Amino acid sequence: MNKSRQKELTRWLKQQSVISQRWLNISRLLGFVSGILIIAQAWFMARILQHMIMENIPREALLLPFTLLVLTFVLRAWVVWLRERVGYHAGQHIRFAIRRQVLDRLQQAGPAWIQGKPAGSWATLVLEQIDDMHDYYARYLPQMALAVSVPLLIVVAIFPSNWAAALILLGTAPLIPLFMALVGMGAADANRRNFLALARLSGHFLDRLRGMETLRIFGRGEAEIESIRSASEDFRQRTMEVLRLAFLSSGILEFFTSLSIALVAVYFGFSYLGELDFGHYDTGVTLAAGFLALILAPEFFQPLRDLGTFYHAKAQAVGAADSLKTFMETPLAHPQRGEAELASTDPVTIEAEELFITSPEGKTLAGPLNFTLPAGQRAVLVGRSGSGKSSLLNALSGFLSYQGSLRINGIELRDLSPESWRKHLSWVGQNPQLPAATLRDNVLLARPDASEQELQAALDNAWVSEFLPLLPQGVDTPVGDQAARLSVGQAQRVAVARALLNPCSLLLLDEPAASLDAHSEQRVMEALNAASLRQTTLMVTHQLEDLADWDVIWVMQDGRIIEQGRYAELSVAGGPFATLLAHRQEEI
């Protein structure tokens, strides 16, 4: 169902075509010229053949019609080559423009919205589904213009010569869709009966191929071969009932293609003998008129035959449009961008009043947040999972929009220009990524032109140089799941080295040295505890011990900072921090 939706998707497809309307017009125009040259080359053969067969004109006297016939063939090949290129350039132009709009939306939304879906899900929308629209604009749209302009030209061209030959071709014009509809009625019932099972059998091979580990640990590998064998005979038997009615509908066009050529031959052949005396205009029927109709009889149905082979390109573009439309119409409130610039590189002062951290979809992630972190002072956020600690850090990063007030040195964060604000910002978060190609390009992500001495001092400080020999190519070894996998603690020291390379104003540590082994946790917290004293710092940790030195502790519960104070004061005084500190730890 949802026809009102499928009509809106096709409505969306034609909106994107305005990007290259110029090339859709040329293809539309070149398909009219392509049908003029089909008639011209059928007219020159019809006139040449009449002279040789009936008038016995020698070929040497027919040089002028031959020359125009060769030219019409050369021109007809040029238009075919030109239409393929114009059609591709049209379709590629939508894909380039749309992919830029998709990535602009993803960059504008930022990591807050990207992290909702897997990166594989985003790759499908950008690569697979944007490419699925190409054949709609490259092949289907030009062909539908060709499927109407060409067959109407043959009918118009044959009609002056003979109105019965043109009526044979035009007679099939309303009969083909009428019979396809009748077959589509029968094919609909068979399609609906086999739809549930075929879609169920479609993913059978991939589901036995995924979870092939489970078939191994249970010794069911051989018993699943008979399962794949049985699901392949069931799929075939169901999909041939669909095809028995689909190739019948596809053969309606091929039935009238031959019935037209058979009738053109029989009518003209009997007209020349005197059996029939009705079709012509009582001027007599010539051999050229029969050749013109016979050469153009298969060309009448060729545009409609190609449209059948390009019709799949419309269904796969509507599905692509379906998902690409929802992506581009989501409300998606995003953080506000200003143009103010921070005055100095000195540590900043953070202060909030009735702050409300808002998700891209508008949901509040942290309730009214009231706090004040003086310049150069390090704070720590503690709380149970889901409290909203990372949401506060993300808002300071500019990744989330806030309703209340959040001032950096008295300047609102929304006023601050993101490009200049992130220059005063550094961070080490949970599940940190290494986007760059190599281990060197990751540490130097903040400043790629830093010299060897600057780079060596950064690796040594973060204790990256101690595990470098274990890697094959030293600093230059590519890092990733596909190349030289790093341990969780080794990749965390690369994130620490990257964050400490540049002097910052505010450093945001989100669960650093969590899920690290003992040695890396000591080394990560060695470098980060030293770096939290050079600027204002905000750390999020589930480890409540050894917080005595930190200037202030904030305890968050359900998006609310409920208890603020030093470690010494909060420990003795009963409260939410005392409960957290005495609470049993569920997992490592």
Partner 1 sequence: MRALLPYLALYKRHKWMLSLGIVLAIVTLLASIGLLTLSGWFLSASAVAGVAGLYSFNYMLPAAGVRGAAITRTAGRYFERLVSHDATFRVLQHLRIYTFSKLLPLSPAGLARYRQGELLNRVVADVDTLDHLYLRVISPLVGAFVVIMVVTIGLSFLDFTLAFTLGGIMLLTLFLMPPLFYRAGKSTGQNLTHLRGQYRQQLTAWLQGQAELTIFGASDRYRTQLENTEIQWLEAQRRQSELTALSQAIMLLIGALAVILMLWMASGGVGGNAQPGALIALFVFCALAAFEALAPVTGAFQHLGQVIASAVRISDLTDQKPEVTFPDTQTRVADRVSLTLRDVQFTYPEQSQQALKGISLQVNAGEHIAILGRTGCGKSTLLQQLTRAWDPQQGEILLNDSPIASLNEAALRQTISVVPQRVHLFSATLRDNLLLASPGSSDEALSEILRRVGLEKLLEDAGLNSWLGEGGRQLSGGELRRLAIARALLHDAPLVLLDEPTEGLDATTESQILELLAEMMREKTVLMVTHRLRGLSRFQQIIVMDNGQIIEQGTHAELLARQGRYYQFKQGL
Ligand X SMILES: Nc1ncnc2c1ncn2[C@@H]1O[C@H](COP(=O)(O)OP(=O)(O)NP(=O)(O)O)[C@@H](O)[C@H]1O
Report the alpha-carbon distance of residue 511 to residue 390 in Å, rounded: 9
Tell me the window of 274-282, 379-387, 493-501, 566-574 that interacts with ligand X (CB under 6 A): 379-387
Q: How far is the CB of 584 from ligand X (least distance, A)?
A: 16
Site residues, Mg ion (CB under 5 A): 390
Q: How far is the CB of 86 from ligand X (least distance, A)?
A: 44
Of Mg ion, partner 1, ligand X, none, which one sits near residue 67, judging by CB under 5 to 8 A according to partner kind?
A: none
**Sequence-ordered strand ranges (E) for 48-202:** none
Of ligand X, Mg ion, partner 1, none, which one sits near residue 216, judging by CB under 5 to 8 A according to partner kind?
A: partner 1
Q: 77 among the known binding-site residues?
A: no
Binding residues for ligand X restricted to 469-498, rule: CB under 6 A: 485, 487
Of ligand X, Mg ion, partner 1, none, which one sits near residue 331, judging by CB under 5 to 8 A according to partner kind?
A: none
Nearer of residues 40 and 382 to ligand X, judged by Cβ: 382
Measured in residues, the chain has a length of 588
Q: Which of 9, 24, 141, 208 binds partner 1 (CB under 8 A)?
A: 208
Of Mg ion, partner 1, ligand X, none, which one sits near residue 224, judging by CB under 5 to 8 A according to partner kind?
A: partner 1
Does 359 participate in binding ligand X (rule CB under 6 A)?
Answer: yes
Residue-by-residue DSSP string for 373-429? E-TT-EEEEE--TTSSHHHHHHHHHTSSEESSEEEETTEETTTB-HHHHGGGEEEE-
Binding residues for ligand X restricted to 101-160, rule: CB under 6 A: 112
Report the alpha-carbon distance of residue 409 to residue 499 in Å, rounded: 22
Indicate the SS3 state at residue 220: coil
Total residues at interface with partner 1 (CB under 8 A)? 147
> Residue 4 CB: number of other CB atoms within 10 A?
7
CB of 146 closer than 8 Å to CB of 87: no
Q: How far is the CB of 388 from ligand X (least distance, A)?
A: 4
Q: How far is the CB of 112 from ligand X (least distance, A)?
A: 5
Pairing mode, strands 536-540 and 378-382: parallel
User: Could you tell me which residues come within 8 angstroms of residue 286 by beta carbon, excluding any fewer than 6 positions away?
Assistant: 50, 161
**Residue 539 has which token pair?**
């750390």
Binding residues for ligand X restricted to 386-415, rule: CB under 6 A: 386-391
Does 54 participate in binding partner 1 (rule CB under 8 A)?
Answer: yes
Binding residues for partner 1 restricted to 217-276, rule: CB under 8 A: 217-221, 223-225, 227-229, 232-233, 235-236, 239-240, 243-244, 247-248, 250-251, 254-255, 257-259, 261-262, 264-266, 268-270, 272-275
Q: How far is the CB of 370 from partner 1 (least distance, A)?
A: 25
According to the 3-state scheme, what is the secondary structure of 285-325?
CCHHHHHHHHHHHHHHHHHHHHHHHCCHHHHHHHHHHHHHH
Q: 378 among the known binding-site residues?
A: yes
Nearest alpha carbon to residue 467 among 459, 457, 455: 459
Q: 475 among the known binding-site residues?
A: no
Pairing mode, strands 552-557 and 536-540: unpaired
Contact residues for ligand X, defined by CB under 6 A: 112, 359, 363, 365, 385-391, 485, 487
Binding-site positions for ATP read 373-380
